[PDB]
Structure formats: C-alpha cells, structure tokens
Amino acid sequence: ADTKEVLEAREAYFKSLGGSMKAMTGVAKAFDAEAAKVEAAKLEKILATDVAPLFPAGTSSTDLPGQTEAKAAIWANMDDFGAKGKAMHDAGGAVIAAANAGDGAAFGAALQKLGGTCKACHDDYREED
C-alpha cells in the first residue's frame, strides 16, 4: 500500500517491540510477577500484528534511502524472513508464559532467547547504518 503509511506502521511496530524489550530487561533483573505480567500483556498485543502487509515490494533502503532500514535482501529470502519472524513469536510465547506463571528464572532465560530472535533477523535484514 501507500509507502508513507506502511513505513509509518512498520516503524511503529518495531519501536513498540523495542520499548517492550527494554521494559522487560528492567523487569528481569528485579523480577516481580505483577510487573512481568503487565509487560507480557503488552507484548501479547504487539505480536498479534500481521507484518506481511508491512513489507510490500518496493520499500527497501535501496528504493527509499534513509527512509527505512529494511534491506532488499528481505524480498529474496521471504521464507527465511518469515521463519525468523515465527521464531520471535515462539520465543515471545515462552516469555509470556513465564510472566503468567510468575517464574522469574524462566522469564530471564526466555528473555535471552527472545533477544536472540531480534538479532537473528537484524543481522541479515536490517541496515547497520
């Protein structure tokens, strides 16, 4: 769809994930089941977003330099890109489950995994400007 709005939506989605990731890191080093649960609820809403519509062809950093960090490589590795997003969803579920179960150790560990899923995709698909 309209590059402007799709770029806006795409940026909103990832910024919210980044905020969520920051909040959860703070929670992990001084775990509290109540705080963990409010963060997991927020994450749960974010992951309910379908990102497919957010990456239409013609919106990479090559097409719109400076306007986005989405690498052209994404559109030639859609299956891989999709599998990496799926890994994030699965890791997110482990974090949420640990928050709901009030298990701090499981939360801390699930958090490491979630963080790894962000890096796995960023390493190949995000501009390291």
Give the one entry of Zn ion, ligand HEM, none that residue 47 binds, where binding means its C-beta sits below a cut-off of 5 to 8 angstroms depending on kind: Zn ion
The token pair that represents 127 in the structure block: 């501009």
Instruction: Note whether 118 binds ligand HEM by CB under 6 A.
Output: yes
| Closest CA relative to residue 40, chosen from 109, 101, 113 | 101
Interface positions, 24-63, toward Zn ion (CB under 5 A): 32, 34, 47, 51
Taking the C-alpha atoms of 18, 70, 129 and 25 in order, what is their torsion angle to the nearest 10 degrees?
10
Cβ within 8 Å of residue 77, ≥6 positions away = 124, 125
Give the one entry of Zn ion, ligand HEM, none that residue 121 binds, where binding means its C-beta sits below a cut-off of 5 to 8 angstroms depending on kind: ligand HEM
Among 24, 28, 36, 81, binds ligand HEM (CB under 6 A): 81
- Residues at the interface with Zn ion (CB under 5 A): 11, 32, 34, 47, 51, 85, 89, 122
